[PDB]
Symmetry: C2
């Protein structure tokens, strides 16, 4: 357990590989899968009840402007947005997008 | 083990919290810590020998233009860049920055 970050990196990649098993293409993910992959890997334990609108914001992000593919980075940007949305801080911080700025 | 991604998210946040213990401010991380935090949490097991220049690129990123603070997202952008740099693909893919594009 000297370097658990390595497996956690593996957890993000290993879990991601499992979803690619449903379709077959592991070189890319569809933003719609962000909705299904988000709840399938994080159902109530995330959208339990705190900041329910945030789930809709992630869903509304798929409806942002021109959403179509998920690169390894886009899935992480969404996961990172999910972490800041609620990683451990008790303060309800919205997405990384500014309000008036 | 139904949802290991939750702990892995905790692994990134828990390990990150441990480094904040060295200084004291957990609301931000210094890009220099990216160099020390990168090797301290991922020493040889990463810069083992494959794509050694990549470590210098991460280090050169701190020397990019105006580097000073690491937001939760910047640390993840660097971690995401590290994952794509070598998450599981055997192809040596550089950073997420394009070459001529």
């Amino acid at each position: 357990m000297a370097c658990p970050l390595e497996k956690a990196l593996d957890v993000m990649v290993s879990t991601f590989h499992k979803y690619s098993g449903k379709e077959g293409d592991k070189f890319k993910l569809n933003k719609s899968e962000l909705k299904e992959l988000l709840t399938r890997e994080l159902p109530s334990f995330l959208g339990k009840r705190t900041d329910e609108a945030a789930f809709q914001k992630l869903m509304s992000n798929l409806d942002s402007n021109r959403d179509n593919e998920v690169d390894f980075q886009e899935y992480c940007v969404f996961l990172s947005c999910i972490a800041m949305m609620c990683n451990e801080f008790f303060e309800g911080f919205p997405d990384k997008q500014p309000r008036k700025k």
